[PDB]
């Protein structure tokens, strides 16, 4: 009998034991929640399917957020088994590698722009809609993952910064849209973490080593600390919070100027 | 005047109520002279004349949905002008239906794509196609956003996300082009009745609320925005880049007004 | 055996069963923490004495934050039973009634400014210092209560906005100063709540009813929801968060304007 | 016949030819503005008298902002010379050297806090009040100088950050208070610069070189750019802007951090 006794949650974005979604799932399950998972993509099906099976779950559905049908079908299918859900976790972001390697101006093409904002920003709004029925029944909450590159320039984050900034604006509009129906909408601004979202990024732990020295706590966060924070936001303890962007970066965002 | 001999491109003049027209008017007031784009044949006719009331020809096709039209637009302008001291981006668009109803219900994928494409990417594309022409004279870039990116306004919906993406662009552009001495800034203008108000049922009632909340108890004008944009396109703004300047009579500063 | 098993916390600012500190204390106790209490003077003595005896505590010490000595003595006294401490909760704010009733320019005198910033802003920094040793022992955390009047203009809040804005800057400098020692520093920006901090403020109901109409969730927060959030920030689940201003206002802060 | 033909302005805070106020004064005068100046005490009299007459002005009044009387008297004096005023420039900040040299927690005493917030934050609100009548005559504007240490932690800036955070909140409440009367209130957040406010700061030069490396423009601002920008804010071109914090830092504030 944990904090999430009898509560259910959908987790989109588990790619490996390292994804931010995994640390979330572990924290939720650790507290008694029942879990469901999506995969983009059946390259990933087998790994996700009973990757679910550490979590007492078999509920594994295909969901590529580029296709409108895949979204609603995944929620109609997931509708078949579950009344509703007390939360939907959005841990999805993507942009064409080339748009994240070089000068922002030179490498940001129109297509690379479309995919970035499409996969990483609109997806959250689409899922929210297809999930609204399941969420009103249970007056669950929504949660997405953002990054403070939306508010500040980081080298090579480029169009992803614009996408995250759009995402963050969405959370606020979703919170007013769904707030009347008792559905809370929030996001976590996590510090940089070495996950599969770092593959192909040459600067990465040079970024990791910089964050380690600048963050007031002198360390980089983990998927556990992110999971624990996401757990709180998906819980009745966070019942008074909506449209909030919680920074889980060891306070990195608060430093103007460190001892070089 | 202050802008003696400097040149500026003005994209987004649709009518005499333009955010861009009032700015363009302010730019000319100080002696700079001007070039203009139009989205299609429609607006070709109206822009041609708006150019000639400011002593200008420089009137080129630019639908920001087409990549070619953009680069051609900066290629045409190369023939006439050595360089450019600034580019003014006053363009935004969404299916409108995405701006009428509940945010969740009415925000489809296409309406999202169009919103961010026309309203957010365009500035970055123009910035690129304009980079060479802008390096010649160490010009600057300027766009108009809306504080719906930070705060929820009813029926602004997907435009809020786009403007938020836009504002992030300004910062990355300013960091990218800053080494080139090219400044990148934006103006967050208060709401004002322009052709960007057609089809919005709540508008003036939005206008009447802003009139009561703004510390100054009034709504800004296209002139006041023009004057501010004039500064940002001027050497007086040489120390400012990646800045979002709020021209809303301070509305952005109130948490809540007397009922 | 709850989440705060064996953890102790100092609660500053319990004036009544409605105090924000009270909702905090209850949530901390709800999870098994041991509690300590301060009171500003005798008139306030009995209330903390019995408010402590409701959380299994008698540790009740006088602390008026206007006097330097009272602060350090309270922590020298509070030392007397406890080896160390896992957290200090700071829920204190005050300004001369007159300073908060009328035009900001006309009514903001120098002293009223002085008392405002002294009692409501510096106090947190002073307590933090006198609490540093006891906080290093257990690598505890610090928490204070703020209000979004620092960022945004509310009528009749006046100098309290400036003070809370100074407070919020303190959290960031404390978090950077004390973050090196593994001690986290964060604050909660709570929505308006009718407590004894509403006495003498006539606009409250139009305040409460307005926030109720604007907040995405269509309602005003409670000391329970604030307590629960503070509980999280004072817990290892918030180990990855420092220098954060957490908004507990039902998302009110995210609305630019609602159908007024 | 410049932009400020026939316009009048009060300038508080000219300490030397390096003062931020000095480059401001130069910019306003360059455009035809009427100028006035204050000095904190006798020692500085000779130099302020001399700077005024380099701008064709003698309007130089004693004003130490620690004393209430000196403020109103200084504005009582200038009531005598000028019908009204089109703007008041506030370029004053100060804190006890010791509070700006060392760990924030260790060196921030209550007094150093009191003086810091008193001289640097309340002064603007007091001046604003004493200036209201003359400012209503011509509905001029108010302007102060802030620093982004209010949002972000700068080493050794300490209590000055909290004061500037209070200052910035003041601008918003002043703008809301005085906006109805047509008086605009704004502030400039200037990049760091070697002025008389750099004496006694050992890290300054390393700070100057860091901003030069991080700022998108790869350089530090000058009093030219600060003077010119405030000139706008004191001008009818800025008639649609109030309660605004304009950053003149070569974009430094927008970087999360550049190439190492
Ligand atoms: N790792 C960090 O430092 C960091 C910081 C801030 C924000 N974030 C965000 O956290 C989120 C989760 O990342 P993570 O590190 O836990 O692991 P991750 O690498 O697995 O995140 C990417 C996930 O998005 C899914 N996805 C991508 N394209 C999809 C599509 N077209 N259809 C369906 N699904 C698709 C993938 O399944 C993938 O699991 C990311 O979106 C990231 O933007 C990460
Ligand atoms: N009016 C306000 O209250 C307000 C508030 C905040 C921001 N803004 C911004 O101000 C900007 C300028 O607005 P305005 O009021 O001066 O007049 P406007 O109505 O003409 O602005 C819209 C312009 O975008 C151009 N445009 C649209 N789609 C295009 C396309 N596919 N290709 C090329 N051009 C296209 C149009 O020519 C149009 O002139 C807006 O984009 C908006 O983001 C306005
Ligand atoms: N209630 C709200 O809507 C709201 C909103 C935002 C922030 N806050 C903050 O919450 C905090 C706590 O308020 P609460 O509602 O839980 O109960 P409360 O009314 O009791 O808060 C005031 C407390 O400050 C203490 N205090 C005042 N002067 C003191 C002094 N000189 N020395 C020592 N102690 C002194 C008092 O003991 C009192 O308990 C406030 O300080 C406020 O800044 C409240
Ligand atoms: N120099 C920077 O990098 C920088 C950056 C951001 C903000 N600022 C702010 O600009 C303002 C002025 O800084 P500066 O660069 O011109 O240095 P400065 O020393 O040349 O000017 C500051 C002036 O405040 C005056 N002053 C101090 N106490 C006073 C009192 N009690 N009464 C009357 N006058 C008093 C001083 O005489 C001084 O001339 C300050 O508020 C500062 O915090 C400076
Ligand atoms: C920190 C940091 C983040 C945080 N983060 C994970 C995000 O928010 C987003 C990631 C992201 C998006 N799209 C990607 C990839 C990663 C690469 C894998 C995938 N193979 C791909 O094709 N495209 O992204 C960065 C980008 C550059 C530099 C630093 C960072
Ligand atoms: C205020 C306010 C704004 C501010 N504003 C001017 C904007 O930034 C955006 C304008 C906007 C976007 N899309 C539009 C049109 C205008 C109509 C012409 C175009 N032909 C169209 O089809 N679609 O937008 C709003 C949207 C809904 C409710 C209120 C507002
Ligand atoms: C909202 C809002 C708050 C929220 N809140 C509790 C605070 O943050 C601060 C409270 C506060 C500060 N000082 C007070 C009192 C209360 C009254 C008790 C005591 N009688 C007194 O002398 N002085 O306070 C306001 C004050 C004025 C206008 C609006 C608000
Ligand atoms: C950069 C930077 C700033 C920005 N700056 C100019 C300010 O806003 C503040 C100046 C400042 C405050 N207090 C001072 C003095 C100057 C010295 C003369 C005065 N006589 C004094 O006794 N005390 O302040 C810093 C403080 C520490 C480290 C770096 C910085």
Task: Say if CB A32 and CB A24 are below 8 A apart.
Answer: no
A22: nearest Cα among A56, A43, A48? A48
Distance of CA D256 to CAs B123, C159, D135, Å? Answer: 22, 32, 40
**CA dist., res. B85 & res. A169, Å (int):** 32
Tokens of B240: 């400012």
Name the residue range of residue B136's domain. 1-259
**CA dist., res. A127 & res. D166, Å (int):** 41
Handedness of CA B94, B177, D151, A151 (dihedral sign): positive
Q: Ligand 6 pocket, B191 CB below 6 A?
A: yes
Q: Does B4 touch chain C (CB under 8 A)?
A: no
Report how far Cα D192 is from the mean position of its chain's Cα atoms.
13
> Would residue D22 show up in a list of annotated catalytic residues for this protein?
no
- Specify the number of domains making up chain A: 1
D228: nearest Cα among B30, B138, B235? B235
Task: Say if CB D174 and CB D125 are below 8 A apart.
Answer: yes
**CA dist., res. B107 & res. B97, Å (int):** 8
**CA dist., res. B127 & res. B111, Å (int):** 24
Of A104, A165, A174, the CB nearest to B103: A174
Q: Ligand 7 pocket, C197 CB below 6 A?
A: yes
Task: Say if CB C233 and CB C171 are below 8 A apart.
Answer: no
Q: What single DSSP character describes residue D236? A: G
Q: Does B81 touch chain A (CB under 8 A)?
A: no
Interface test with A, best of D100, D149, D203, D257 (most A CBs within 10 A): D257
Chain B CB contacts of C214 under 8 Å are 256
**CA dist., res. A15 & res. C194, Å (int):** 46
**CA dist., res. C208 & res. A240, Å (int):** 15
> ∠C117-C121-C124 over CA atoms, to 5°?
150
The catalytic residue among B121, B156, B172, B246 is B156
Strand order, beta sheet including B140-145? B59-61, B33-38, B7-11, B86-89, B140-145, B183-189, B244-247
Task: Say if CB B168 and CB B148 are below 8 A apart.
Answer: no
DSSP string, C166-186: HHHHHHHHHHHHHGGGT-EEE
First to last CA, chain C: 47
Binding positions of B for substrate are 94
Token match 């959290």: residue?
A: C171
HSE-CB of A138 using CA atoms within 13 angstroms: 23
Distance of CA D90 to CAs A99, A249, B172, C103, D9, Å? Answer: 45, 36, 32, 21, 11
**CA dist., res. B218 & res. B210, Å (int):** 7
Instruction: Please tell me the experimental approach by which this structure was elucidated.
Output: X-ray
Nearest atom, ligand 5, residue A145 CA: 8
Distance of CA A205 to CAs A192, A198, D115, Å? Answer: 9, 9, 44
Tokens of C10: 């100092």
Task: Say if CB A174 and CB A88 are below 8 A apart.
Answer: no
Tokens of D109: 């005493």
Which three-class secondary structure state does DSSP give residue B14? Answer: coil
The neighbouring-strand residues paired with C187 are C144, C245
**CA dist., res. C169 & res. C176, Å (int):** 11
DSSP string, chain A: --TTTT-EEEEE---STTSHHHHHHHHHHHTT-EEEEEESSTTTHHHHHTTGGGTT---EEE--TTSHHHHHHHHHHHHHH-S--SEEEE------GGGGSS-HHHH--HHHHHHHHIIIIIHHHHHHHHHHHHHHHHT-EEEEEE-GGGTSB-TTTTHHHHHHHHHHHHHHHHHHHHHTTT-EEEEEEEPP--SGGGTT-TTHHHHHHHHHHHSTTSS---HHHHHHHHHHHTSGGGTT--S-EEEESTTGGGBS----
Of B148, B152, B258, the CB nearest to C155: B258
Q: What single DSSP character describes residue B235? A: G
**CA dist., res. C187 & res. A135, Å (int):** 30
Task: Say if CB C168 and CB C174 are below 8 A apart.
Answer: no
Distance of CA B118 to CAs B11, B91, B130, B156, C238, Å? Answer: 13, 7, 17, 15, 41
Chain D CB contacts of C127 under 8 Å are none
Tokens of A159: 């169009």
B91: nearest Cα among B168, B162, B193? B162
**CA dist., res. A162 & res. A169, Å (int):** 11
Chain A CB contacts of B120 under 8 Å are 113, 117, 162, 166
Distance (Å) from the alpha carbon of C142 to chain D's nearest alpha carbon: 13
Q: Buried b vs exposed e over B43-79: b needs ≥16 C-beta within 10 Å?
A: beeebeebbeebebebbbbbebeeeebbeebbebbee
Report how far Cα C173 is from the mean position of its chain's Cα atoms.
17
Q: Does B120 touch chain A (CB under 8 A)?
A: yes
Neighbours of B184 (CB within 10 A): 29
Phi-psi region of C158 (alpha: psi -120 to 50; beta: other; left: phi over 0): left
Which three-class secondary structure state does DSSP give residue D117? Answer: helix
Binding positions of C for substrate are 95
Strands B33-38 and B59-61: parallel
Q: Whose CA is nearest to atom 13 of ligand 7?
A: C94
Token match 């150093």: residue?
A: D112
**CA dist., res. D63 & res. D80, Å (int):** 16
Distance (Å) from the alpha carbon of D21 to chain A's nearest alpha carbon: 25
Strands A141-146 and D34-39: unpaired
Subunit contact A222:C240, Cβ cutoff 8 A? yes
**CA dist., res. D100 & res. D52, Å (int):** 31
Distance C20 CA to ligand 3 centre (A): 7
Binding positions of C for NAD(+) are 13, 19-21, 64-65, 92-93, 164, 193-197
- Residue of chain D nearest B236, judged by CA positions: D228
Q: Does A83 touch chain B (CB under 8 A)?
A: no
Cβ burial of B258 (10 Å; 0-12, 13-18, 19+) is exposed
- Residue of chain D nearest C129, judged by CA positions: D105
> ∠A113-A23-C88 over CA atoms, to 5°?
105
Listed in sequence order, the DSSP H helices in C31-158 are 42-53, 68-79, 104-107, 110-117, 123-138
Neighbours of A251 (CB within 10 A): 28
The neighbouring-strand residues paired with C246 are C188
Which three-class secondary structure state does DSSP give residue C138? Answer: helix
Subunit contact B121:A113, Cβ cutoff 8 A? yes
Subunit contact A210:D149, Cβ cutoff 8 A? no
Number of H helices, E strands in chain B: 9, 7
- Residue of chain B nearest C255, judged by CA positions: B152
Report how far Cα A242 is from the mean position of its chain's Cα atoms.
16
Subunit contact A155:D259, Cβ cutoff 8 A? yes
Distance B192 CA to ligand 5 centre (A): 39
Question: Which residues have C-beta within 8 Å of that of residue B19, sequence separation ≥ 6?
Answer: B12, B90, B144, B189, B192, B194, B196, B222, B225
């Amino acid at each position: 009998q944990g904090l999430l006794a009898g509560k259910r949650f959908l987790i989109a974005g588990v790619a490996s034991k390292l994804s931010i979604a995994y640390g979330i799932a572990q924290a939720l399950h650790r507290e008694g929640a029942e879990l469901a998972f999506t995969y983009p993509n059946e390259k990933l099906k087998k790994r996700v399917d009973e990757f679910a099976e550490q979590f007492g779950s078999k509920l594994v559905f295909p969901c590529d957020v580029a296709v409108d049908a895949e979204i609603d079908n995944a929620f109609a299918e997931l509708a078949k088994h579950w009344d509703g859900v007390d939360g939907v976790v959005h841990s999805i972001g993507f942009a064409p590698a080339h748009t994240l390697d070089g000068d922002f101006t030179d490498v940001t093409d129109r297509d690379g722009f479309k995919i970035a904002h499409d996969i990483s920003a609109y997806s959250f709004v689409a899922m929210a809609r297809a999930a609204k029925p399941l969420l009103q029944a249970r007056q669950g909450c929504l949660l997405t993952l953002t990054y403070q590159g939306s508010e500040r320039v980081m080298p090579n984050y480029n169009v992803m910064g614009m996408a995250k900034a759009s995402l963050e604006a969405g959370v606020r509009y979703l919170a007013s849209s769904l707030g009347v129906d008792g559905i809370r909408v929030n996001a976590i601004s996590a510090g940089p973490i070495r996950t599969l979202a770092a593959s192909g990024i040459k600067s990465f732990r040079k970024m990791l080593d910089a964050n380690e020295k600048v963050a007031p706590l002198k360390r980089n966060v983990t998927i556990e600390e992110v999971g624990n924070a996401a757990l709180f936001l998906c819980s009745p303890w966070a019942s008074g919070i909506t449209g909030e962007i919680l920074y889980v970066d060891a306070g990195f965002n608060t430093v103007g100027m460190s001892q070089s």
